[PDB]
Design a protein around this ligand. Sequence first.
Ligand SMILES: CN(C)CCCN1c2ccccc2CCc2ccc(Cl)cc21
Ligand SMILES: CN(C)CCCN1c2ccccc2CCc2ccc(Cl)cc21
Ligand SMILES: CCCCCCCCO[C@@H]1O[C@H](CO)[C@@H](O)[C@H](O)[C@H]1O
Ligand SMILES: CCCCCCCCO[C@@H]1O[C@H](CO)[C@@H](O)[C@H](O)[C@H]1O
Ligand SMILES: CCCCCCCCO[C@@H]1O[C@H](CO)[C@@H](O)[C@H](O)[C@H]1O
Ligand SMILES: CCCCCCCCO[C@@H]1O[C@H](CO)[C@@H](O)[C@H](O)[C@H]1O
Ligand SMILES: CCCCCCCCO[C@@H]1O[C@H](CO)[C@@H](O)[C@H](O)[C@H]1O
Ligand code: NA
Ligand code: NA
Length: 511
Amino acid sequence: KREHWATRLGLILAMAGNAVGLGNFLRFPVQAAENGGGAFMIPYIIAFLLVGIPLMWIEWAMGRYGGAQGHGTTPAIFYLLWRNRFAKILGVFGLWIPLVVAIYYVYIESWTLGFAIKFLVGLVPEPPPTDPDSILRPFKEFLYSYIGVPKGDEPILKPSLFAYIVFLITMFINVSILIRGISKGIERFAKIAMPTLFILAVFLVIRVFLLETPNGTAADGLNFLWTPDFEKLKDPGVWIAAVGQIFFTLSLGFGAIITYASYVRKDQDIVLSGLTAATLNEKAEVILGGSISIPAAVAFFGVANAVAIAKAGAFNLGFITLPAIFSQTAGGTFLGFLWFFLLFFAGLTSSIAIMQPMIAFLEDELKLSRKHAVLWTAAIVFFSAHLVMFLNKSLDEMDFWAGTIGVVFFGLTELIIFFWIFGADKAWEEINRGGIIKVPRIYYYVMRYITPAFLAVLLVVWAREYIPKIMEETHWTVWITRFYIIGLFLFLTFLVFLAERRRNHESAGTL
Ligand SMILES: CN(C)CCCN1c2ccccc2CCc2ccc(Cl)cc21
Ligand SMILES: CN(C)CCCN1c2ccccc2CCc2ccc(Cl)cc21
Ligand SMILES: CCCCCCCCO[C@@H]1O[C@H](CO)[C@@H](O)[C@H](O)[C@H]1O
Ligand SMILES: CCCCCCCCO[C@@H]1O[C@H](CO)[C@@H](O)[C@H](O)[C@H]1O
Ligand SMILES: CCCCCCCCO[C@@H]1O[C@H](CO)[C@@H](O)[C@H](O)[C@H]1O
Ligand SMILES: CCCCCCCCO[C@@H]1O[C@H](CO)[C@@H](O)[C@H](O)[C@H]1O
Ligand SMILES: CCCCCCCCO[C@@H]1O[C@H](CO)[C@@H](O)[C@H](O)[C@H]1O
Ligand code: NA
Ligand code: NA
């Protein structure tokens, strides 16, 4: 009774949409810009080869394996691979991480829809005729008024009425797709969204490549991004940034690739399919995402200033700088619309992917109907999102624990359980089974020894030289978000406990 992807194309575009999202167009540019541009790319490429690709196959394999037995989420799948109560508990992260990411990701996605709407109808700011700030300030105030940045000392946000309603609409749109299921919902939408997304992105790159000012050209932006710095490879922070981006952009460690793969027929290839999805994401990221905002910013403000803007972070580059720059060109407001529409489709195809794990768990383990599973999941995300919408820095806290530390920790966890506990040879066999192509021989040793060792070191260095400076150097309000998401973990563990009991009570009625 489990759904399955209808076509190979659909599967590939759905998986591609899972990966290609806000991380490609917003996160990548910031990470690369603040880490030296080209100096970021070497570790990034290496991370993609030693972590991205191998974990992608591992997650597809685990998902297809679990699906064959009617399970699409990690609490059950981890137990199938390691029959130990602790496997179910660690598996909870496969529901918690995607749920927590969704709680702030859908909200950011809603901003892009709201901006798309306002830019389409021309309800945007109008700067004067060369001073930077005189042009950027109006756009900064525009964003600040939208999300309600604090004007006082209280760490409280005051979202505009329009932003709140657009978030509601955004949740509604995510639900309209998810409620139709895998083949008729997610797959059908991906076939529409991905082509649209690709065309919009190419057009924007072309337009940005035409940008030129007394300060530079788009070419200067590209040179900054693709010019190596072999003297930065010794910087740990750059590696942590690169690996973190690889996980986020490929949706690895979210339990999302696994859940999507659980709808792939038991015999269907995952080697070539997985590699293709990963390659598509990388193209969209380094070629499309990398060629839009960085080159535009560099062309208008020069490299030094572009970098400063990125380090200023706070969504400056994508929500303030790029539109401000576009406003200086004929048809620039429409150009802004295209940008935000692109971001919206990129985010939407990814948010449905990160919400599906909770949906699958409720359907697979608690036996809820798809309708009910989708509605309760949306309700939980909608409610919880109020924390991100009203408490300044809550978004940052969730993105750190789930979207940064969480995904890397879970990636290592799933690899250990699948390639070490379940059995390296059994895992290798499982990955290659039905493959249109075989995984290169060398990757067996990468998956069994290199990847885990690489991640283990990363995490160690991370928790010893970086985390401490946060667990003690933040406003007391970070504890509100920490308290809440720990509660979410507790609640999800309770649900796994209930699924466990329903299972036994149902098994007893069978014997
Ligand atoms: C209401 N639907 C009959 C219209 C079909 C188009 N559609 C779509 C396409 C594939 C799968 C699900 C959905 C339903 C919701 C939705 C939302 C936004 C857009 Cl941009 C298209 C879109
Ligand atoms: C610093 N914070 C204000 C933002 C944190 C979240 N964020 C994020 C999260 C989900 C989707 C898009 C983006 C875009 C901006 C960005 C840039 C770098 C990092 Cl590492 C995180 C990051
Ligand atoms: C069911 C959970 C309810 C949580 C309380 C939500 C209160 C939202 O309240 C609304 O917030 C909007 C954005 O700031 C404002 O524009 C509206 O005027 C305000 O009524
Ligand atoms: C896509 C549909 C969006 C509907 C929300 C529009 C929010 C526009 O703006 C709102 O308009 C209201 C009057 O209609 C005013 O009372 C509010 O003060 C104003 O912020
Ligand atoms: C942890 C998340 C808590 C969300 C509770 C939000 C309660 C909303 O509170 C309301 O917000 C409006 C707009 O900001 C204000 O105009 C109202 O005076 C205020 O009561
Ligand atoms: C983390 C929780 C954030 C909640 C945001 C609440 C925003 C509501 O706004 C607050 O309402 C209070 C009345 O109760 C007033 O005394 C405050 O001055 C006002 O800023
Ligand atoms: C560190 C990860 C490197 C990945 C690059 C793999 C390139 C594939 O390498 C090729 O694999 C084939 C099948 O195993 C072999 O028959 C070829 O001799 C070998 O060159
Ligand atoms: Na991505
Ligand atoms: Na996406």
